[PDB]
Amino acid sequence: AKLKLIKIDGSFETEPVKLSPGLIAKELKQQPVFDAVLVEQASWRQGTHSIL
RNA sequence: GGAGAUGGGGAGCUGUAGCGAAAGCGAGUUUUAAAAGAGCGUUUGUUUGUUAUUAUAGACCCGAAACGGGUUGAGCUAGUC
Ligand SMILES: [Mg+2]
Ligand SMILES: [Mg+2]
Ligand SMILES: [Mg+2]
Ligand SMILES: [Mg+2]
Secondary structure, X not given: OOEEEEOOOOOEEEEEEOOOXXXXXXXOOOHHHXXXXXXXXXXXXXXXXXXX
């Protein structure tokens, strides 16, 4: 793809960088993405609730 | 590594060949003198997430008369001095 550089002033570079096709995948998986987000949200739990 | 996602870590676990108590043999094996007959095999995996059931824990909640171990009581009362 056309991934292009950014300078400090906010103007764009005139030379875009080509991208190897291995990065972009023609097949997208959404269920593994959902499970990854859920396990990231989990393990953030302190779990210090206690009752007698 | 942030009380992280994760990376390293292949120790192991399931499946890949089964049969027999076993030595053993092996797409065959056990029984038997038998190769016949019969039994079992000659294929469909694994790791997670969710739900249902189940096993160990008190295991849906409330309820005994009880049992065992320790301490406190003879200012009431019973006896004795
Ligand atoms: Mg790990
Ligand atoms: Mg046969
Ligand atoms: Mg599968
Ligand atoms: Mg008295």
